[PDB]
Symmetry: C5
Subunit: 334 residues, 5 copies
């Protein structure tokens, strides 16, 4: 089911398994990280001048979110939507904090199905609050840039770090689609030249799969559309243009998914075609052999009477000619 | 049946049974409630210092609705659109009172097709006038929060009471959709593997019911559209943020309804794919036992002539060989 | 067959039968009504202080229309579109008069097909000029309101009179949809279960009707759209609220029509399903009796050899075994 | 081919046979017309204060168009867009003249498909420069209005001359669609009751043609859209109101085209229905004579044994009873 | 493999074969060109007072591109999307340099499916920086115009040279469409009257290839829509109108691809009719020879009784009578 209260902290998902707090504070020269299971050890990062990313992996522990929320000054309505996993990826704007909800898919090969967790992000002063349902993600390459000063992540502010985690999750969508395209191509070829039972079963799954994505990606476009024109954390022409490379990344997917659904729309029709092509050929064999073997067992049936003479190389000779008379007629359709 | 007069008080619904006036007045410290059949006793509540929730259930009583409209100061054209329950969910903005028309869906499981009542809301000064068609609703959580002081409902003003009732009403659609989801997931799956008579029947009703739903949800989103950028009795940064967690809740439902229709649209094309191959499976059996058994019923037919000697293990030997030649020939289509 | 002149007065319609000029002049207290064929007797009303409604039934009298225009002050371009019955319902806001083109459908039960007369309206100073193609209209209740002092038609000015008629015309469309709904709600039931010759025909005609209805209601809503954010003669806070109830009524219709088209769209798809299964109903009986009786007409055909002895109950015993072997095999499809 | 040059005068049309220049100059009481092959005899009509309609029929003569453009001061890009006939119907607003591209369709009756020529219209000081590819245009009624001095064509200025032609060009489309309506009204009838081989050959040509028009009419509507809210040469109190009845006329066309395409849309699906029902009619016949005459040819097959005696009217009595038993079973599907 | 780094420089295509730098510098009377394998030699062109076209064919050399970037002050984020060939055709606007990404199509005739290379363009001061993947392009007519001094390419500025290359590209899409046109116009025919196995194969591929085009031309028009109401380097009344004939052309393309997509849309609905019809032709032959011959193989079967006397011409007379009855009965279906 769903929820019924007015605005309380309740988890909706199904990852009541893991709990970690992977914080990675870093400036221009120094960086420190630690993976703890205590909130009192990570809260003081609030008024820290050094850019800090606070990852909480295991949002089943409600009280922890409430503890982090009441301290940072997050309004009740927002903290709820962090735990409510069936929410529409959105962008909420307030006076002192920016709130963003995102999704992260993980697809299984061969067996068709995809399940996702809700990655919640919040930007305040110099902090990036991250929220996951389960352990393990696709933020590993972002961690790598922090750990060994790769690129320019160390040089930049906190909102860049946000935009670094966003671009990396959008990068995962690329890989996701890149994994889907290879899964369509050959399996879509086996629709025309290998049509049977589960061939349709696997198709309806893809439509559902594609709808699943487009309904999650469609608002992702407007997510970045509202963040391009207003810019509350400003620092304009360094973060904003970097954001276009992420917007070009999101608009890319938008039309890329419409490409798959557009093809799979007319893909189910192709099935009936290659099946109807074999409907007629099974109708052909059945008709020819009834067209010629039916009159000949009929002329043998009346000959099978037993209550004029002549015929063995007389009737069975015209029986051989009439058999050829019907074969020639059967090449005005082949 | 439809209307004809210029704009009088006529009830078009078919619930002329129940009638009970329920009023719930509360402040930050006190709480009072009662259930009566007299309208004169609920009138002085118009100019109350403390927020008041006036629930008038069973509006088939024409003059009773009129009595409230005359006292509170509600324009006659609106009082018509309350008794007329076939209206499109809309939001009217007046200088004094706020008017909202909403729907409440009661869905019957297994046996398909749905019926709905019209919940009309009016917000003036510090009162919320609620108009229902029949006894029994989904606003019990609101009642439960007033009665035992749960959440923050007591602390806030009169407009929050409106938004509290709206949150409970919108949360019903979640369950409504969640019930339709479980009435498709296990029924759509059985469309391909178990296709029969009532399989096409209940398929078309879903198509009807989804359209019935989307044409009521589509304006229901727009009900909140004007209820965002205008907001006359504002109290801004208290109701507006709470509103957004209902606007993102109404969009979620709206787009989830689109997820439903899109799958059901091309669902009937899948049905023909489940038949096409099961038409050809009946074709393969009908052609084989006519292409192997027609030439052998013909050879026995010509051997039935009774007007060369030799064969019993000579002719049946070749009739068996020719029968095997057809087995090899029927393995270029499997 | 259409028009080619620069812009004069040619009646393109098909009702070249009747001609009557009905006039209803009323105030807050007095009321008069008279019917005449003399055009000279109905023109003095142009400068009348009291509101008046002039019905010009049967516009096939080209010269009569020319007389009214040159007197009331009607630009020839506007006069032309009135006799041009193949017009897109529109609203012209000329500096001194309001011009509105409309449509009125009368439906035939059982035997489908629809036809319309173009009801044109003009508001200037204190008079409403009405135009019809034939005798008979849906404006009977309006007359009943003026004659018997019903509602608030006597008390108001001349623009309300215009909106009274428009309210009546829209209310006609409400019954039309219900009549069409009742010609689908019960006819749809026999589309799936009684599949015959004309069953396909009516689907096409309803699709034709709904399009011939769509492209008349789609602009009809936009007629009021421009008539919403403008109104030159105005009296806003006394007309705008009234008019709105009609704009909510037309937007109800606009959606209602799209509701029908949406159902009837994939209604023909259902028809092939009501055939594919019914083809396989017959495919069963045809295959059964040739799969069990074809080897048995073959084993008895080879026993038709006359040129082993043994059995009457020796072969008929295996004939009963081989027959049952095909009865067991035919329960992997049922 | 299309082209490789930057912006030169190249003719990609295929009507290199005719060459005539027709000029009509008038004021209000006088008018002159002459057909000449010289361009130096028509150039001095640029500085003519009285309205001049210069028509250049057969633009294949490259340099002939250039001489007009060089003298009247036409910019290179437009000059090419006169000879390049594939151009998308557009309207160009420049500093000293108004340019308009319009298509004229010639429809072939019975035998389908249609070809087209490009008409170019340039409006300068007091001239309307017309361009054509072949002798044959729907501008005759305009000529006849000038010749016998009909309507009000004389009284007005130059831009009215441009609008007159356009109004007479739009009227051709009313007839053009009228010729398509009938090509559907009569042929679409015999689609459901005359299923041949080349029936689909013509149906597909409507799906080619209805696209051919809507790609030309779509810009046409918008060609007037911009010609509504702009109008540089002004005299709007007689030109703009006249324009409106050409704009509604161009909307009437656009709306009717998409009325046709929607009926033709689900038309082909109707064809499969009339085939699937007639597949059942043949399925009904093919089963009976194999459901009754397959077991009866079998009982005579077991009586084909010749290696009990009893009856002739005893066996044929049970052969006749079993046969009528199957006649009763065949009344559970009809 | 897709991208994972932050915003560095990596080639993503497949053509890591060639490397050529081609520079064309000119003015009113002068012209220069050369092919160098050294990058340092094409650097001082940035500050040339004369317009220059710098082509860097073979971008895979990351260092070469990086060298040009840091020299021209091109921001890394833009430089990425140059080597990142898997992008959306977009237009960027900076104060000093203008950037444009445009796809270029190469099509193989008869044997379907196509391949593309990304052409990057950077305009700054008086230079146009082109970025091809492989040797061979569509910029030949331009090179012809620069050397021989054809047209007005010499007389205009640097931005015109960018526009001269753009029109040369938009023109190639006309050639691409023309090929695909005849790859459909004649191939569409031979699907109805020539139905085969691989015929459905290429039908689906052109469904995809239309998406590949339209989902690349759709934003290729937006490239010019943004490049219309902007004009940073301007040169106004010279380039502004020139652009429009490149905009009108790219509109034509968009209106041409949608045309195919609308015809090829329901092209497979025709194919099921090509089956459905010839299914029933085969159904007619299968029924007749079982409707005339089956009741006569039954009479001859019961006449094959061996356990009345009379006729050879008494039975074969009624055999002929019944055979005729079935012939007359088959004239209610032809």
């Amino acid at each position: 089911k769903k929820g019924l209260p007015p605005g309380t902290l309740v988890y909706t998902g199904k990852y009541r398994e893991d709990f970690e707090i992977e914080v990675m504070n870093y400036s221009i020269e120094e960086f420190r990280e630690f993976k703890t299971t205590d909130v009192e050890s990570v809260l003081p990062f609030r008024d820290s001048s050094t850019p800090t990313w606070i990852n909480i992996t295991g949002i089943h522990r409600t009280d922890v979110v409430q503890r982090v929320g009441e301290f940072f000054g997050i309004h009740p309505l927002v903290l709820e939507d962090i735990l409510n996993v069936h929410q529409r990826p959105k962008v909420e704007f307030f006076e002192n904090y920016v709130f963003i909800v995102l999704k992260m898919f993980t697809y299984d090969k061969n067996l068709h199905e995809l399940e996702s967790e809700q990655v919640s992000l919040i930007l305040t002063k110099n902090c990036v609050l991250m929220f996951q349902e389960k352990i393990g993600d696709v933020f590993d390459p972002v961690r790598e840039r922090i750990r060994y000063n790769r690129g320019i992540i160390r040089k930049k502010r906190a909102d860049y770090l946000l935009y670094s985690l966003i671009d990396a999750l959008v990068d995962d969508y690329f890989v996701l689609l890149e994994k889907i395209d290879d899964e369509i191509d050959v399996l879509e070829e086996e629709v025309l030249e290998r049509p049977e039972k589960e061939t349709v079963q696997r198709t309806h799954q893809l439509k559902r799969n594609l709808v699943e994505l487009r309904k999650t990606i469609w608002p992702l476009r407007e997510v970045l559309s509202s963040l391009y024109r207003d810019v509350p954390p400003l620092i304009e022409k360094e973060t904003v243009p970097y954001f276009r490379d992420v917007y070009d990344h999101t608009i890319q997917i938008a039309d890329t998914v419409e490409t798959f659904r557009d093809i799979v729309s007319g893909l189910l029709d192709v099935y009936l075609s290659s099946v109807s092509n074999k409907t007629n050929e099974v109708m052909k064999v059945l008709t020819i052999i009834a067209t010629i073997f039916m009159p000949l067992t009929f002329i043998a049936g009346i000959y099978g009477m037993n209550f004029w003479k002549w015929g063995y190389p007389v009737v069975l000779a015209v029986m051989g000619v009439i058999a050829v008379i019907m074969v020639v007629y059967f090449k005005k359709k082949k």
